[PDB]
Amino acid sequence: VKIATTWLGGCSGCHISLLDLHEELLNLLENVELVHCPVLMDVKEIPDEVEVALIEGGIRNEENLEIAKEMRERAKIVIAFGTCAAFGGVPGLGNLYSNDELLDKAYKTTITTKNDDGIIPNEEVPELVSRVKPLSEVIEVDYFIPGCPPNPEMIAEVVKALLEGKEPELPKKNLCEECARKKSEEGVAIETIKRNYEGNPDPEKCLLEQGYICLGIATREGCGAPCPSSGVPCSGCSGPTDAVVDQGAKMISALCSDFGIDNDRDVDPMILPKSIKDKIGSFYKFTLPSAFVPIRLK
């Protein structure tokens, strides 16, 4: 099967996760024909008759937009490869600023920058798109592999399903099932909200119950929940489930509902908003571009 890969406004992490198949990558390449992959081979142009296309990264500039459309016309099946392609990713946080503000910082006001002329690179470089957009906003996407980056095994299962003429199936639950942390039978009740550095977390008890903002509740399973298992809350990098459009909104809903639930009628509703100094960064680290309100109005 002829497959091709490319990268847009991402970090290369999804391609690195594909390489993290290790010995299995060679076995995968035996049953597949890699016709385009900038990081691995020197085929400069996307060829015609591509069967499966793995597109990493979201839309950040006019060149990405061009390549997405180019790959869409040459590929039969297009896959939004990873959280950046599927939801926008961390680069999506740039949507909280105007493109002029992003560029002025990087090319003028950064402390080590010496640019008295105040020039913004504009020759032989693509202009940025008004805002970061998920791949599906600009082209028709057939499938998506969520994760920042998706685990190697999940990438193989998806590609192997397409090789066998089968429909890929993503896991459907939120992360708490996979998570090894202990959850109360009585249900979740949050007394106070803590920043990740505040306090000393219990390694067995659920991090959300302990007062930490854990996105596991509003995030699709599949990663194996290595973050809570490694002592830190989930940041929601796999994105939401199939039944949730806006991950951050649903996380805020859940958090607000169980906050002070044991003192439901008497808990001060102003405590929670005052406690969270960075609301967008707390609930939309990986999915701001795919949210109902994906930008900060200027």
Binding site: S12, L93, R195, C227
Partner: protein
């Protein structure tokens, strides 16, 4: 006639080389352009400073550990906390494991295709798969090296890609004695494969010398790297700068980097052009990573790497300015990192339970610095009293080799091109081979 090599392949990120000729057919302009930028420095404003080690790894998928640790370090300085010795060891263990994965990835997956096949016209042969068909043991060993590196990162960092254990004050988890013992058993093999890789590199660079490709993109410059009491160190130390003749010009703590480094801007690229602030853009050009680090170091901290380094210095001298020798210095560092993994695992403090310190009052500024596989990495954050970022500056490794790449690609074309007919697939690939010698990570470089 306007030729363009786009995209530059077997490099991380988006880059291109433009080659132009005048109406008389003579070579006129040759430039290296980086066509991507995301704006991490600006969008980090308003974020919780403790979330920086979650965001910065997303600058790059290859060197996410370096970013995780550079941010974790800057964050520890923002909260005025000195982390326990066990945390420093665990952080360095993760860092060395990442360096093994990155150096192995570049030399075998990205660079070797050209060193093995420098004169072929077949692009379907000039890649990982081409090497695997003829020499499967070369790639199987490369995969083993990477697997070993990523295993250390997964065990110490929680995740092989985008680790999460470097938190405020230290580490979120300890290395269990069982985990330490298994990594220690597996550690010997990594050193062994890294040592076997140096011979592969010697043999492959000999093939490059036989085709007069060892001097491609040659130019002299200053060199920057981190040194711990003059010794090679990728985790802790001071940043040392040597001139083209090898004499030390600067030695400074990373927190004072803004008084030594300056970054220029050109209209044809999203990648900035740094230089030694006081020397200027013309006389202040410097290079980072592998060869630059070996050039500033008095010696390697590991016994095996030191032998190959001493053998290398006696043959090519010091400082070595050859871009193609960066491949060889990379292999020396690959071995040195493999050796450091064993050394750190052999330290009994690595399994300690005092892994984190309580955060102190918020100090409004913090500079975190480590030597990423591709060069000096500096994460600088400024925050308010509540620890919310107000300003940031990221001097990311490959940006410092941007002038070298722009110069080197020009020097290659000057040596092989006189008219557009001379710009053949092999000659255009020689220009890409120069770019590849610096192991560029353009997503990293632009951020």
């Amino acid at each position: 006639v306007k030729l363009s090599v786009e995209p530059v392949t077997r490099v991380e990120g988006h880059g291109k080389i433009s080659v132009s000729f005048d109406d008389s057919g003579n070579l006129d302009k040759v430039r290296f352009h980086v066509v991507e930028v995301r704006g991490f420095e600006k969008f980090l404003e308003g974020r919780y400073v403790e979330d920086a080690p979650i965001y910065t790894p997303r600058i790059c998928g290859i060197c996410q550990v370096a970013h995780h640790l550079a941010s974790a370090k800057a964050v520890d300085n923002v909260f005025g906390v000195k982390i326990p010795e066990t945390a420093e060891l665990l952080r360095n263990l993760m860092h060395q494991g990442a360096t093994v994965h990155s150096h192995a990835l570049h030399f075998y997956m990205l660079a070797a295709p050209d060193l093995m096949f420098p004169t072929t016209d077949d692009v379907l042969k000039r890649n990982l798969m081409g090497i695997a068909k003829e020499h499967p043991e070369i790639i199987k060993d490369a995969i083993e090296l990477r697997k070993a590196g990523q295993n250390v990162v997964r065990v110490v960092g929680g995740r092989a890609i985008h680790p999460v254990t470097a938190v405020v004050g230290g580490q979120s988890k300890s290395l269990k004695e069982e985990e330490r013992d298994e990594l220690l058993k597996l550690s010997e093999r990594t050193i062994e494969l890294s040592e076997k890789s140096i011979e592969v590199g010697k043999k492959l660079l000999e093939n490059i010398k036989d085709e007069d490709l060892l001097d491609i993109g040659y130019f002299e410059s200053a060199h920057m790297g981190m040194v711990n009491n003059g010794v090679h160190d990728l985790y802790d130390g001071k940043l040392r700068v040597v001139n083209s003749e090898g004499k030390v010009e600067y030695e400074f703590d990373p927190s004072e980097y803004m008084n030594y480094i300056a970054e220029g801007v050109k209209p044809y690229s999203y990648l900035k052009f740094p230089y030694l602030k006081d020397k200027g853009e013309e006389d202040g050009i410097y290079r980072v990573n592998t060869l630059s680090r070996l050039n500033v170091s008095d010696k390697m901290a590991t016994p095996l790497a030191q032998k190959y380094y001493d053998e290398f210095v006696k043959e090519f001298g010091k400082p070595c300015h050859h871009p193609m020798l960066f491949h060889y210095a990379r292999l020396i560092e690959l071995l040195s990192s493999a050796e450091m993994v064993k050394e750190l695992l052999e330290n009994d403090k690595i399994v300690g339970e005092d892994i984190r310190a309580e955060p102190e009052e918020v100090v409004g500024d913090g500079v975190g610095c480590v030597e990423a596989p591709r060069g000096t990495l500096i994460h600088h954050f400024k925050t308010d009293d509540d620890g919310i970022i107000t300003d940031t500056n990221l001097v990311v490794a490959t940006v410092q080799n941007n002038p070298a790449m722009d110069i080197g690609v020009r020097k290659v074309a000057e040596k092989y091109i006189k008219a557009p007919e001379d710009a053949t697939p092999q000659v255009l690939n020689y220009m890409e081979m120069l770019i590849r010698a610096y192991d560029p990570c353009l997503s990293c470089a632009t951020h």
